[PDB]
Amino acid sequence: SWTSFVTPAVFEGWFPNRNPFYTYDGLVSASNGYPEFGTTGSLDDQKRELAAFLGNINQASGGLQFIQEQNPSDYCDTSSTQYPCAAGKQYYGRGPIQLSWNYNYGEAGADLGLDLLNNPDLVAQDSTVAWRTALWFWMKRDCHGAITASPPSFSGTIRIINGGLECNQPAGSIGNMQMENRVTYYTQFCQTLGVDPGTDLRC
Ligand SMILES: CC(=O)N[C@@H]1[C@@H](O)[C@H](O[C@@H]2O[C@H](CO)[C@@H](O[C@@H]3O[C@H](CO)[C@@H](O[C@@H]4O[C@H](CO)[C@@H](O)[C@H](O)[C@H]4NC(C)=O)[C@H](O)[C@H]3NC(C)=O)[C@H](O)[C@H]2NC(C)=O)[C@@H](CO)O[C@H]1O
């Protein structure tokens, strides 16, 4: 199990100022629903996956200090008709991975059997739902396959999570800096776990 290397102490050391809404046990419990997460490939692939998942979360949530996107648009894409926006509701970033947009809340809600399209706030109000949405995005959108492949691709996870705004950005631009911060956190977490991060890091 991945909890053998990401212990409560490792987690607390990485997120010392986390909002109390986010707990280690919450992540563990939610991960039980995605048995392949952190158990795919070699032990080093397992370590890289946890470092990549939590490194991306470190960037998105500000070290788990934030539950909701700070100073957000309502993120309702009217061209995305499969998952209809609910009147007055907003799909700004929520949870560890800052799940955004009606299309992600809708697909996640469908896969998780949750009322996320009509009640997106559940992601910021129920920590079990919050962790499940982060793991759901990671698995369903295939950040999992990107990082656990041989060779591993941390860059692939960034592309999938927020590539339009963070990848292929001029060096030093805000998007490029966010991208580099994800790489910095991933490599720092890999150092804690004693694993090589791989060479495919930036996008
Ligand atoms: C320089 C630096 O690193 N500053 C930090 C701030 O960046 C950080 O605030 C957080 O910033 C991130 C951007 O890195 C922002 O991210 C949002 O995240 C969601 C989810 O990844 C993105 O949604 C994706 O949208 C695309 C379409 O554009 C979809 O294709 C994709 O499916 C979506 N992904 C998911 C998982 O839903 C948003 O696009 C993205 N927003 C932007 C404009 O980039 C977070 O919301 C910010 N977090 C907070 C809490 O506001 C800040 C955190 O405290 O720390 C700074 O240091």
SS3 call for 94: strand
Experimental structure resolution, Å? 1.6
State if residue 22 touches ligand 1 by the CB under 6 angstroms criterion: no
Distance 59 CA to ligand 1 centre (A): 8
Distance 199 CA to ligand 1 centre (A): 24
Task: Judge if the beta carbon of residue 165 lies within 6 A of ligand 1.
Answer: yes
173 CB-near residues (< 8 Å, 6+ apart): none
Q: Is the CB of 70 under 6 A from ligand 1?
A: yes
Asked whether the beta carbons of 185 and 55 are under 8 A apart, the reply is yes
Q: Where in the chain is the domain with CATH 1.10.530.10?
A: 1-67+126-203
In short, whether 181's Cβ falls inside 6 Å of ligand 1 is yes
Q: Is the CB of 80 under 6 A from ligand 1?
A: no
CATH topology of domain 68-125: Endochitinase; domain 2 (3.30.20)
- DSSP class per residue in 42-86: SHHHHHHHHHHHHHHHHHHHTTTT-SB-S-------TT--SSPPP
Q: How far apart are CA 30 and CA 174, in angstroms?
A: 32
Contact 58, 92 (CB under 8 A): no
List every span in the chain annotated with CATH 3.30.20.10: 68-125
Distance from the alpha carbon of residue 114 to the mean position of ligand 1, in angstroms: 23
Q: Give whole-number Cα distances, 61 to 3, 33, 70, 178, in Å.
A: 22, 22, 10, 12
Measure 42 CA to ligand 1 centroid, in angstroms: 30
Thinking of the domain 1-67+126-203, which architecture would CATH place it in?
Orthogonal Bundle (1.10)
